[PDB]
């Protein structure tokens, strides 16, 4: 599952949806991480692949996993403006008030970037 976890990180990184599904079916470590602390869920959240996010969550991905800087996948999704991914992470138990290395939540990030829709979603969902 360790060799498959390395392959899983690369498939999630490149947005290879089918590859991720095949790798999870073979038992790849869903909580594996690369040299940046980024797990497959962090990588999927950055590229905007909603189906990969859901596949990893179905196979037991830690929705509150932190990278080398203390960032959760919710922080990654908010930083790049992926609203539907933010909504799916919130539905699967993401801590809405998780703070990054500057004490900021997904809400503070959305406000700092002027994303009014993201801030509104975060307010209404929590």
């Amino acid at each position: 599952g360790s060799d498959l976890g390395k392959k899983l990180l690369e498939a999630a990184r490149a947005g290879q949806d089918d590859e991720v599904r095949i790798l999870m079916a073979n038992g790849a470590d869903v909580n594996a991480f690369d040299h940046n602390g980024s797990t497959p869920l962090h990588l999927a959240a950055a590229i905007g692949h909603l189906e990969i996010v859901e596949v990893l969550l179905k196979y037991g991905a830690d929705v509150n996993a932190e990278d080398n800087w203390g960032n959760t996948p919710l922080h990654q999704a908010a930083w790049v403006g992926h609203l539907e991914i933010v909504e799916v992470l919130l539905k699967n138990g993401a801590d809405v008030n998780a703070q990054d290395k500057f004490g900021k939540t997904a809400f503070d990030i959305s406000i700092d970037n002027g994303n009014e829709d993201l801030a509104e979603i975060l307010q209404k969902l929590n």
């Binding site: 498939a11 980024s38 962090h42 990654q76």
Partner: protein
């Protein structure tokens, strides 16, 4: 005893049932050699044990594919390279120390920085290359 067990002896006739190996071992099973030059996955050795090369190392023919398990010890990257690491794809806004990192692959499949003001990625280094 299996012929791959050392002079010492074994606890069963199988390759994975020796007390010590004559040459190499893959997951406790004695082997004649690691997948250095041929076979899958490609491997390197450490203390007479076979370990897999990172899946992003380009499998080399007639020469070693890697000298360690990290994506930074490949003889060549199968797809793209970001700094010292062989990666399947250049960053697509993955968080780094100061926020999202966006890069584009050059002619030599090396990940180069996007311009400071690109928010959806880039296809080159200039501001007009954003997206």
């Amino acid at each position: 005893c299996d012929p791959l067990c050392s002079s010492g002896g074994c606890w069963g006739p199988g390759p994975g049932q020796c007390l010590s190996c004559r040459n190499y071992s893959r997951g406790g099973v004695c082997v004649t050699h690691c997948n250095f030059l041929n076979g899958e996955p490609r491997e390197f050795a450490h203390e007479a044990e076979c370990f897999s090369c990172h899946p992003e190392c380009q499998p080399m023919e007639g020469t070693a594919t890697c000298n360690g398990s990290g994506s930074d010890t490949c003889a060549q990257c199968a797809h793209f390279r970001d700094g010292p690491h062989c990666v399947s794809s250049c960053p697509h806004g993955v968080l780094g120390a100061k926020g999202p990192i966006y890069k584009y692959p050059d002619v030599q499949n090396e990940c180069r920085p996007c311009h400071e003001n690109c928010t959806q990625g880039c296809k080159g280094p200039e501001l007009q290359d954003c997206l």
